[PDB]
Design a protein around this ligand. Sequence first.
Ligand SMILES: Nc1ccn([C@H]2C[C@H](O)[C@@H](COP(=O)(O)OP(=O)(O)OP(=O)(O)O)O2)c(=O)n1
Ligand SMILES: [K+]
Ligand SMILES: [Mg+2]
Ligand SMILES: [Zn+2]
Ligand SMILES: [Zn+2]
Ligand SMILES: [Zn+2]
Ligand SMILES: [Zn+2]
Length: 865
Amino acid sequence: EQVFHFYWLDAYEDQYNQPGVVFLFGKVWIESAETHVSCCVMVKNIERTLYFLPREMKIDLNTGKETGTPISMKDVYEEFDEKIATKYKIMKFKSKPVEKNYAFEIPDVPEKSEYLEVKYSAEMPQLPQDLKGETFSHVFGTNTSSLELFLMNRKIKGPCWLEVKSPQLLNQPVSWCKAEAMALKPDLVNVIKDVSPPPLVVMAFSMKTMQNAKNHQNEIIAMAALVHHSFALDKAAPKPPFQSHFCVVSKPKDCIFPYAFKEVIEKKNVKVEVAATERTLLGFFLAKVHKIDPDIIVGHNIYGFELEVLLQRINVCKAPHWSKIGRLKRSNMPKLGFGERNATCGRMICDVEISAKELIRCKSYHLSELVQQILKTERVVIPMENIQNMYSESSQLLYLLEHTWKDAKFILQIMCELNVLPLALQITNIAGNIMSRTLMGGRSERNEFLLLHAFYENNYIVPDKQIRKKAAYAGGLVLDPKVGFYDKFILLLDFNSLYPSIIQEFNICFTTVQRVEQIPELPDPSLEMGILPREIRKLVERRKQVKQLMKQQDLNPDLILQYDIRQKALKLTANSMYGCLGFSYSRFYAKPLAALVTYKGREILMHTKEMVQKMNLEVIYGDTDSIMINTNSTNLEEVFKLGNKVKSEVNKLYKLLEIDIDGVFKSLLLLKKKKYAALVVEPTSDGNYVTKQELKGLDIVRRDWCDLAKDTGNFVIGQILSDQSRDTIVENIQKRLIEIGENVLNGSVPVSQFEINKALTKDPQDYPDKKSLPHVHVALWINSQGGRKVKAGDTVSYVICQDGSNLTASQRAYAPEQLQKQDNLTIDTQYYLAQQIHPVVARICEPIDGIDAVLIATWLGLDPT
RNA sequence: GCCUGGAGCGC
DNA sequence: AGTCGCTCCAGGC
Ligand SMILES: Nc1ccn([C@H]2C[C@H](O)[C@@H](COP(=O)(O)OP(=O)(O)OP(=O)(O)O)O2)c(=O)n1
Ligand SMILES: [K+]
Ligand SMILES: [Mg+2]
Ligand SMILES: [Zn+2]
Ligand SMILES: [Zn+2]
Ligand SMILES: [Zn+2]
Ligand SMILES: [Zn+2]
């Protein structure tokens, strides 16, 4: 024979132009060059695979009545061969009788049955999905794609080594890869698992734009990029994260670079290529991308902005070889991230803004906010305006260029900090999907793939692909809180992986629960564990192991944050598995199952409450799978004893389900359902402990309340949960607010603490009631005013100003720069004292005796009415 | 209070 | 394009 090893990373198909063909992209070892290079494997002749379901008794399609003659596979085969194939234009085909299982939403389909599996070129016509005949009642697979077929049949679950037997050469090169090969049939490709993974080539880049003097155009004038040629995803990120880099700068048109600039660059020795025109800069960039040939391009706000600006300028400046940004040689450039995901076809795009949204929470996910929170450093901002002025002098252009470089380095460090790539790989190996898609975010598709693999593996027919809202079933139970402040220790118990455990504990699966608004019946405790509980069980074990590691002997603060991020990521994947059950658009939609799971949950929470009560214990709160108990005790060791005592009494009633001590609070301020604050006990040595404050649902934690309101609100909480007597406190509070009020008026407050943030659900142009929505208004401005443009999903920052236009506060919203820049605009102190600070402090103090709404208004010097 | 619209916390 | 439960605010009536 003849065979070659190849490590795949990305896949792609163009069902319209090249049906039955799937392009794979990855790495191949070149011994002579002692290094891995990019490789493109084109897999052809992936055949459509259909399953025909035979009728019990034959039927006449002209009369619509039975005939008395039973059916046999030969009956079906012949019909397909004589009537179906011929009628639909299917020249050749192969077929065979197989036994498959079913357990999905199509009625009239038996659990197990014999089917006639048919296969034929994806180049020949597609049969209708609702096709039926004399010998067969239904046909599955009619529309399966080549890629899904390929990934499933060869059992490819994420990046891995493949062996390609009998590789062919290609008349002409189809990609921008070093190597290429072609397989004539998918069974030539095979997964092997005894060869370690190769390191990847990572490239992190950043760019700068500038609005042109006359014409309205966002011209790219600077790009920076860092590169690492041996970045391994099965170990710590390299230190440093890059080995090389490059910068490139160009002049808008009319401008001229400061002179000596050339020499200034030679002087300080900076790997900075200075382009004459934007077209040259774009040409230079693509050239570096092609030469560096990165397997992963990483940046910030790639999908939402950068990628689109880049492709358009590339089209405008008629730059050479746009497809080099991807790995597939193309001709026509698609636009709008679909047209985008295809543009970079073959290279995985990793957007830290997207990855961050998925892994951690922030008030905004803009780069500055991110560098601050994750890297713990400040990031200078260079406003589009200040840019022009920088071309006048050498040092300034040189500074801007260095600034672009720093963003690329930040983006790269943030990526390594959250540990995005290794996590993305791990998840992709678990779901069996495509890693570039995992990096785009979303839980649904990963779930779908995880299940598809599981069912193919178990010999099941799987549903065909088909082609915030209001709840559609009962959710979790939230107990009514006994609101107030608490001195004595509070006991918080929470079930471990509740829903996933409920699914296993009762063996809930598409294969064990009868269904068709009604809650189905728990299946016979006799039946065997279904596919769903098995897969779910696996995700829960992975998580436990990662939690086990965390428990470990003295670890790095940074490494411990990663384990925690990973652990929650696995938690999310398990819950999304439950969720997709109730996801109308899901391919494995089965509302009844979702409904039956949440049902048992509320039932279990009820019984857990009632039980804790029979033990003569005080239950002050509860949320879906938790119980809060007021021990009324001051003896910690005794509390813990009571805790493990109640734990034991609960776990005793279930096979898998396990409740545990989630925490113990020294003091607790319980305001409303899903809203409380607390000092959390953290034991040390000799029954001694440290305490840490924790917030849940308060306004202080939300993004849509200025920091001025939030910082003050946190002060109040700090005091409330304190040791000090109620008196000392109420005084300190009053003392503080009165001061806050004075400062807000004497203009001592930093303009930033006045910013309010809100994310847009839709693009600013899609809102009808516009004008009265401060965030929508300020976005419309930013948009129609300069470069970058705010779209759905972005958070908008704004402040309320004094226009001198007697409009409502909601209609006097401005950008922070629009304020600091303009003179007729000034901060509406009235608004902030009464609609921001007052509401927050009022809601917090609501249960505190001594404080009250009217009183809080007088401290801030407002008129109590 | 309802209604409409807008927020994003909590599981 | 995982689920549902629970406040919050602008504004008209
Ligand atoms: N994003 C989420 C969070 C929670 N839940 C549901 C399923 C969980 O089982 C239940 C309880 O929420 P938890 O935060 O307690 O999650 P678990 O109990 O399952 O995990 P843990 O062991 O951390 O408590 O709520 C969900 O569907 N989606
Ligand atoms: K009060
Ligand atoms: Mg739990
Ligand atoms: Zn081999
Ligand atoms: Zn919980
Ligand atoms: Zn709404
Ligand atoms: Zn109102």
